[PDB]
Design a protein around this ligand. Structure first.
Ligand SMILES: [Mg+2]
Ligand SMILES: [Mg+2]
Ligand SMILES: [Mg+2]
Ligand SMILES: [Mg+2]
Ligand SMILES: [Mg+2]
Ligand SMILES: [Mg+2]
Ligand SMILES: [Mg+2]
Ligand SMILES: [Mg+2]
Ligand SMILES: [Mg+2]
Ligand SMILES: [Mg+2]
Ligand SMILES: [Mg+2]
Ligand SMILES: [Mg+2]
Ligand SMILES: [Mg+2]
Ligand SMILES: [Mg+2]
Ligand SMILES: [Mg+2]
Ligand SMILES: [Mg+2]
Ligand SMILES: [Mg+2]
Ligand SMILES: [Mg+2]
Ligand SMILES: [Mg+2]
Ligand SMILES: [Mg+2]
Ligand SMILES: [Mg+2]
Ligand SMILES: [Mg+2]
Ligand SMILES: [Mg+2]
Ligand SMILES: [Mg+2]
Ligand SMILES: [Mg+2]
Ligand SMILES: [Mg+2]
Ligand SMILES: [Mg+2]
Ligand SMILES: [Mg+2]
Ligand SMILES: [Mg+2]
Ligand SMILES: [Mg+2]
Ligand SMILES: [Mg+2]
Ligand SMILES: [Mg+2]
Ligand SMILES: [Mg+2]
Ligand SMILES: [Mg+2]
Ligand SMILES: [Mg+2]
Ligand SMILES: [Mg+2]
Ligand SMILES: [Mg+2]
Ligand SMILES: [Mg+2]
Ligand SMILES: [Mg+2]
Ligand SMILES: [Mg+2]
Ligand SMILES: [Mg+2]
Ligand SMILES: [Zn+2]
Lengths: 23, 116, 127, 97, 155, 83, 206, 60, 97
RNA sequence: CGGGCACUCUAACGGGACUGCCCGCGAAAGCGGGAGGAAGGAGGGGACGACGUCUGGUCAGCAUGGCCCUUACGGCCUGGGCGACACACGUGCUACAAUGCCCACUACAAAGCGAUGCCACCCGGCAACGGGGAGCUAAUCGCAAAAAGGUGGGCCCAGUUCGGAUUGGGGUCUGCAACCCGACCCCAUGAAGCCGGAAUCGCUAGUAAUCGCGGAUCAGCCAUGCCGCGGUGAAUACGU
């Protein structure tokens, strides 16, 4: 999951924000 | 092959079975179910034929799907390989295109390993 | 009228205030069950008073900062045991036997150079 | 498979095959040779050939030095054979009592 | 160890039944240090064995442990040339360890989909002498019986 | 890719030789060290020699190769395969 | 090689810094670069006088230098002829109030950076190293030190095969922190190579 | 290629990207800390002497 | 009447935090005791060797200790003596209001 | 906010643990056990690395003997390469799923960093981001959300709502400039992979396992690395 860019867990691993992980 | 040229899995939720259409992910799934006001949790085996033709007409008239999508992606690679750009060369020989390492790994583009 | 104790666990530090009452407990502006909901480790903080039958005799205004939820629970356990020893000096027996009056120095060990973690070594290939 | 490394030298695929053919001598024992790595180099004295092989009964480490390059390869094979011949027979020594 | 006999850790009793045997069973269920999740799976299984069987969960859990505890085990010792299977009695420390470990291992190998069901059902059959956890004991106990001839080689 | 807020990048000194050839009449062969420059519609029809670290590869610009860069058509690696 | 530096291992325990001042994040590297330019011009000039330690103090747009030397006359001069000649070229580079002082070395043979430089000079003059080293430890011990050790590595005497020759006497506990150990290094340049001289003087624990 | 590079890095470049940190003491182009302007080797050499104000060995 | 004191050596910093608290306390009047602010450590990790040998480091640090004293009751008698004080070298003072 | 330094804390200086006391074995040294105590027999971790070995590594960080180059084996610049790919090896990241995946809501850290720097808050946008704009030479203000976890809802054993590779199209930012060769966002594509042969690595308590955060270098970043920080928190040691 941590590698999936289109998920919450995946953007926590990367350290970025988006539609699936807003701030 | 009800929609949209393929048969969507019944007994599954409509927002899920719609992804089984070449050209529709989770994004375009939640899109076509609000534009038609159809409950995404309802199962395909429980759909109203009225709700079918509405979801059919909207989906088939908004995004390119199935064979028409495969033609442009092939044609977009076709022109890339015809003009002679660096990305076209990577498609002609079959090597990775997006600046990836080729000394190791790169096995999806090359396929299983060939002993020597 | 009021009794106080101090407890620490790793980085968690708790200030507990024992007051006579029916048994209500407050943690950082909310009740015990509201701050430790669904945590099995919760019921062990109210154990020092269970060893001296002070279950529903006191109320608890308790704050806590630092560490995680479980470290805060153990910090409460040491704190309310201190406030019971000062509530009754004879409470050292039936509290020190159960180890409630001591504070474990088991803290996170330093991550060291050359290792992946505190002691996890990098995998090597001899030959 | 088998890997060869030429440190601060330049060898041909012909010379690389000769090292592969000399390592066939260890196949005599009918035991698994796990990634035999070979290292060649050039001292002031003569060539040096290293080898670090793993077998299911231990590892093999040896070194050969001689003025002739292929001769040092031979010495390395002689010393590898001896270590291999011991790792496959040392257990058979203490069968009694 | 080489120097002294390694001391046995004393587990703090659980917060529901106050049993050190329950705490040990939790840890073997525990993965990645997630004790809260492992605490649920056991206590929820205590509810599951309560529904399908109207008796005390504490009895079904302890009885199942007695029915997996191996009395004799085999431990290899190469004498001369061949590797013999030497029959040895099992110490009470190791008995709990092997009983709890096979219990969870036999549980996870069950078909049902929720871990609480697997943990509950294995304790249902192990309390009654069934399941892969009890078979592992009978199999270990049959292997030590067949090698009773080599009993004199014990250390 | 480059930002839409910023402009379509051409090395200026290269675009100069382009417009000078569009007035008097195309075309004459242009040698350049501008792999970074983007092909522009005013370049369609000419023949530009793009330097690849060694050679100046002649590249004819067409209608379908406008959105790309010059360095995509003068590759930099001689590779015929293995074996 | 496996030994730690005896001075860096005792900073803030037995020995104090040679540059003692505070600076902000935006000015540390600038004041440090000038601090080495001062010791660059001083270690070259004040070599012939017997330089041992260069202290540097700073406050704000001003800097005070303290030079400990065995022969203060070679640094000061005839009534101050060189001392003023130093402050002139000092502020020419410092661009600020460069106040220069002189400090007396009580015992030169008890200073490690001086013992090393004498041994480095001797072996530069075609002297017997095994014989000069024993004299070096003999002079330091006669001067009341409670332990000494000299180490010279390299082509000693001109031999092709290198060699690390050394001599020691007394007590040199390099593992004790509460022991005072003065340490200095000198570089002896020869027609055949470079020798590394190390000096250890154990003045006595605290 | 050495002194011509410690001299190329000192002058002001044509573009502000081409600026890179070098060692002011020895000229090393890698492992140069901004705070001191020194490399990792010189950071350890001057620290062992005491010529880095307030810098000392760490241990915890 | 805020006086902030920063320095690298806490032994010399506390000596300055003592003399300024003592100075304003004598010549009138109220002084808020020297409070120690949390330090700011600037740690450095570096390979011991000048070549390879990655798993060998030495840790250096730069401790920037902080103090703060407050003269509650001013009186210009203190504002003159503090302009003439022997503060050590490795300590920076900041005075604000 | 008044007010207070009690408490937590922050950071300097001390006290404290020394087999000191008791039982027993002891020739002594010491060993087993108990009490007291926050801590007991080096209290846990770090720093510290003996004479020497590997003619070990480092002339490419530096210095240095020498030998060689001298309209060039010096120096400047542009472009390319260090990013190649029939293959082979080592170290890792992410996975093969229900003790799990996804969505919504809600709690609990420590250590650091921050003046063409960190960005509160508002607004445009699905978003990356952009345009406004307060604070903070920073125990003041900011990075900042800690994540696992907790609550609720969905998925129902499928190459799937596992996995997120590869590829098509559309944007953002840095930068003189992202073709070779940057990161990120969004739509679409949705692979191998069903727990791994011979063989082999790590770890004895806050350790392994698992979860997140910060920093150096740094315009940006190929960092899944390195160095630090805490959250949850085991199993096992008969024996040589
Ligand atoms: Mg996970
Ligand atoms: Mg997915
Ligand atoms: Mg689809
Ligand atoms: Mg940890
Ligand atoms: Mg090879
Ligand atoms: Mg070769
Ligand atoms: Mg080569
Ligand atoms: Mg060797
Ligand atoms: Mg032979
Ligand atoms: Mg297990
Ligand atoms: Mg089993
Ligand atoms: Mg049966
Ligand atoms: Mg050149
Ligand atoms: Mg040089
Ligand atoms: Mg740069
Ligand atoms: Mg740099
Ligand atoms: Mg490493
Ligand atoms: Mg007080
Ligand atoms: Mg003892
Ligand atoms: Mg020691
Ligand atoms: Mg050598
Ligand atoms: Mg040389
Ligand atoms: Mg050199
Ligand atoms: Mg260039
Ligand atoms: Mg260039
Ligand atoms: Mg390049
Ligand atoms: Mg590439
Ligand atoms: Mg091969
Ligand atoms: Mg392989
Ligand atoms: Mg990696
Ligand atoms: Mg499956
Ligand atoms: Mg598929
Ligand atoms: Mg398959
Ligand atoms: Mg999927
Ligand atoms: Mg797994
Ligand atoms: Mg095996
Ligand atoms: Mg150990
Ligand atoms: Mg990180
Ligand atoms: Mg940073
Ligand atoms: Mg960066
Ligand atoms: Mg890449
Ligand atoms: Zn340097």
């Amino acid at each position: 999951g941590k590698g999936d860019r289109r998920t919450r867990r995946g953007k926590i691993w990367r350290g970025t924000y988006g539609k699936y992980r807003p701030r | 092959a009800r929609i949209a040229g393929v048969e969507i899995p019944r007994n599954k939720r409509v927002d899920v079975a719609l992804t089984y259409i070449y050209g529709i992910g989770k994004a375009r799934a939640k899109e076509a179910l609000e534009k038609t006001g159809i409950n995404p949790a309802t199962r395909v085996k429980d759909l109203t034929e009225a709700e079918v033709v509405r979801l059919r007409e909207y989906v088939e008239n908004t995004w390119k799907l199935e064979g028409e999508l495969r033609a442009e992606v092939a044609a977009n690679i076709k022109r890339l390989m015809d003009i002679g750009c660096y990305r076209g060369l990577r498609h002609r020989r079959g090597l990775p295109v997006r600046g990836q390492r080729t000394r190791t790994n790169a096995r999806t583009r090359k396929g299983p390993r060939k002993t020597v | 009228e009021q009794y106080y104790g101090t407890g620490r666990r790793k980085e968690a530090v708790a200030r507990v205030f024992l007051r006579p009452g029916n048994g209500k407990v407050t943690v950082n502006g909310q009740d015990f069950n509201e701050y430790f909901q669904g945590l099995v480790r919760a019921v062990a903080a109210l154990e020092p008073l269970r060893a001296v039958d002070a279950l529903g005799r006191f109320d608890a205004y308790i704050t806590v900062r630092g560490g995680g939820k479980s470290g805060q629970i153990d910090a409460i356990k040491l704190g309310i045991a201190r406030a019971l020893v000062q509530y009754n000096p004879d409470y050292r027996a039936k509290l020190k036997p159960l180890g409630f009056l001591t504070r474990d120095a088991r803290v996170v060990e330093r991550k060291k150079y050359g290792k992946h973690k505190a002691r996890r070594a990098p995998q090597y290939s001899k030959r | 498979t088998m890997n060869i490394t030429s440190k601060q030298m330049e060898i041909t695929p012909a010379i690389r095959q000769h090292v592969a053919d000399r390592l066939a001598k260890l196949e005599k024992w009918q035991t698994h040779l796990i990634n035999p790595h070979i290292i060649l180099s050039k001292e002031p004295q003569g060539f040096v050939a290293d080898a670090t092989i793993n077998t299911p009964n231990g590892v093999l480490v040896a070194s050969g030095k001689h003025e002739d390059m292929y001769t040092a390869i031979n010495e390395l094979i002689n010393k590898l054979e001896r270590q291999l011949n011991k790792l496959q027979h040392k257990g058979e020594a203490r069968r009694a009592a | 160890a080489r120097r002294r006999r390694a001391e046995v850790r004393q587990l703090q009793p659980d917060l529901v039944y106050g049993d050190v045997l329950v705490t040990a069973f939790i840890n073997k269920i525990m993965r990645d240090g997630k004790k809260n999740l492992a605490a649920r799976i056991f206590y929820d299984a205590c509810k599951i064995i309560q529904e399908k069987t109207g008796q005390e969960p504490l009895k079904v859990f302890k009885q199942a442990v007695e029915n997996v505890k191996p009395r004799m085990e085999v431990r290899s010792r190469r004498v001369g040339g061949a590797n013999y299977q030497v029959p040895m009695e099992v110490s009470p420390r190791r008995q709990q360890s092997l009983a709890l470990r096979w219990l969870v291992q036999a549980a996870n190998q069950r078909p049902e989909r929720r871990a609480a069901v697997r943990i509950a059902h294995e304790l249902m059959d192990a309390a009654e002498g069934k399941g892969g956890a009890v078979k592992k004991k009978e199999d270990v106990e049959r292997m030590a019986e067949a090698n009773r001839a080599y009993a004199h080689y014990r250390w | 890719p480059r930002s839409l807020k910023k402009g379509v990048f051409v090395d200026d000194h290269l675009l100069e030789k382009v417009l000078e050839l569009n007035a008097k009449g195309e075309k004459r062969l242009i040698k350049t060290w501008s792999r970074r420059s983007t092909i522009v519609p005013e370049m369609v029809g000419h023949t530009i020699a793009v330097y690849n670290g060694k050679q100046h590869v002649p590249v004819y610009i067409t209608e379908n190769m406008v959105g790309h860069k010059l360095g995509e058509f003068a590759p930099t690696r001689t590779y015929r395969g293995h074996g | 090689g496996n030994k730690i530096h005896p001075i860096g291992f005792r900073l803030g325990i037995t020995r104090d810094w040679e540059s003692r001042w505070y600076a902000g994040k935006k000015q540390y590297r600038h004041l440090l670069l000038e601090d080495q330019r001062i010791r660059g011009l001083l270690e070259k000039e004040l070599y012939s006088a017997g330089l041992a330690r260069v202290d540097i103090e700073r406050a704000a747009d001003n800097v005070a230098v303290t030079v400990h030397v065995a022969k203060p006359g070679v640094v000061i001069g005839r009534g101050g002829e060189r001392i003023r000649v130093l402050r002139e070229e000092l502020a020419k580079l410092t661009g600020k109030n460069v106040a220069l002082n002189v400090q007396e070395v009580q015992n030169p043979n008890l200073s490690a950076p001086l013992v090393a430089q004498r041994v480095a000079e001797q072996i530069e003059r075609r002297f017997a190293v095994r014989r000069a080293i024993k004299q070096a430890v003999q002079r330091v011990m006669e001067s009341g030190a409670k332990g000494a050790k000299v180490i010279v590595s390299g082509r000693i005497g001109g031999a092709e095969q290198a060699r690390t020759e050394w001599a020691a006497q007394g007590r040199v506990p390099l593992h004790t922190l509460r022991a005072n150990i003065d340490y200095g290094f000198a570089l002896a340049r020869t027609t055949y190579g470079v020798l590394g001289v190390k000096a250890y003087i154990f003045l006595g624990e605290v | 290629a050495r002194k011509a590079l410690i001299e190329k890095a000192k002058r002001t470049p044509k573009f502000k990207v081409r600026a890179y940190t070098r060692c002011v003491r020895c000229g090393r182009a890698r492992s140069v800390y901004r705070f001191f302007g020194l490399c990792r080797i010189c950071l350890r050499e001057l620290a062992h002497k005491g010529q880095l104000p307030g810098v000392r060995k760490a241990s915890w | 009447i805020r006086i902030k004191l920063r320095g690298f050596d806490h032994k010399t910093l506390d000596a300055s935090a003592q003399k300024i608290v003592e100075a304003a306390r004598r010549s009138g009047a109220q002084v808020s005791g020297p409070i120690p602010l949390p330090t700011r450590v600037r740690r450095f990790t570096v390979i011991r060797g000048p070549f390879k040998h990655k798993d060998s480091r030495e840790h250096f640090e730069l401790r920037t200790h902080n103090r703060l004293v407050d003269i509650i009751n001013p009186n210009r008698k203190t504002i003159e003596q503090l302009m003439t004080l022997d503060l050590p070298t490795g300590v920076e003072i900041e005075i604000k209001t």
